Design a protein around this ligand. Structure first.
Ligand SMILES: [Zn+2]
Length: 322
């Protein structure tokens, strides 16, 4: 549809500005990586490479991963996503048997501080980088994910098995808990997203999946930008999660034809609206973890965002107007 394509054209205008800043961040990040490598605790550290930039302007997100030897997890309450970690030289942060996140974060923060979720939010001039520490575990994924990643009918059972052989990550968050992270898998599915292995590799198989995700993120950004903080709790992660569920529901590449961009976008919006109304948005990897629970976002805010998105959809997205 013309309006949506005009919006996608407008977003392209900002590409080089994002590009150039990325190389400035990358220079600083490359610089911290080497100094973190000197410290005993962080000697194995490396760059995970994930998030918006890696997937397809002043804000950037970077994850530092650290290989931790044979890990053992303990689920904080019945949270599904939060854990204490223990083992089957990081013993300096051991609270007896349990790895202290705030001990690890304090030194991690101090080293970067010396050099100059999120751990560090740091600055080169008008560049905000969030830097996150992630423990890497090459073990089987925890049981809370056993019913997650429901890609079998879309990306295939074989791909699901291959993805679950990859490591998983833990990011520091009733204190001292770590949360599961699969940002590496999120990037892999967005960049290898078709039922056809050649989806978006030639002119006959251009789908509109990525453009739909971009449009959904831009929709939420624009609605937030209009308010000085009713929508503070909503993030691009909610939009991305909802988008993954919509790919599951529409597994065929022929359901994402570029010429059907308007209909595909409507699908994404209508699903996100359903999530708002039912107050349920399951983490794509951890189904019992409800991103839209009342513990996380009050009923009123969810109700409020429902009204605006409903208004936008019923009037052809005036927020996207010239
Ligand atoms: Zn494609």
């Amino acid at each position: 549809a013309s309006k949506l394509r005009a919006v996608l054209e407008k977003l392209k205008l900002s590409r080089d500005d994002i590009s150039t800043a990325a190389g400035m961040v990358k220079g600083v990040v490359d610089h911290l990586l080497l100094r973190l490598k000197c410290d005993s605790a962080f000697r194995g550290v490396g760059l995970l490479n994930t998030g918006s930039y890696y997937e397809h302007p002043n804000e950037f997100d970077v994850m530092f991963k650290l290989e931790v030897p044979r890990i053992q997890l303990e689920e904080y309450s019945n949270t599904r996503a939060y854990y204490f970690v223990k083992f089957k030289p990081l013993s300096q942060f051991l609270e007896g048997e349990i790895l202290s996140a705030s001990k690890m974060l304090s030194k991690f923060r101090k080293i970067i501080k010396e050099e100059i979720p999120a751990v560090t939010l740091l600055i080169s001039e008008k560049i905000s980088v969030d830097i996150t520490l992630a423990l890497e575990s090459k073990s089987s994924w925890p049981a809370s994910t056993q019913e997650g990643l429901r890609i079998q009918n879309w990306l295939s059972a074989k791909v699901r098995k291959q993805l679950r052989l990859k490591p998983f990550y833990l990011v520091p968050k009733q204190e001292e808990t770590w949360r599961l992270s699969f940002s590496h898998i999120e990037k892999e599915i967005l960049n290898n997203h078709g039922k056809s292995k050649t989806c978006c590799e030639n002119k006959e198989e251009k789908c509109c999946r990525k453009d739909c995700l971009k449009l959904m993120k831009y929709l939420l950004e624009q609605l937030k930008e209009r308010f000085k903080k009713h929508l503070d709790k909503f993030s691009s992660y909610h939009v991305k999660t909802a988008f993954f569920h919509v790919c599951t529901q529409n597994p065929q590449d022929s359901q994402w034809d570029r010429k059907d961009l308007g209909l595909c976008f409507d699908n994404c919006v209508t699903y996100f609206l359903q999530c708002l109304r039912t107050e349920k948005l399951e983490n794509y990897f951890i189904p019992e973890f409800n991103l839209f629970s009342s513990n996380l976002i009050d009923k009123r805010s969810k109700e409020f965002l429902t009204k605006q998105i409903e208004y936008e959809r019923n009037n052809e997205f005036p927020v996207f107007d010239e």
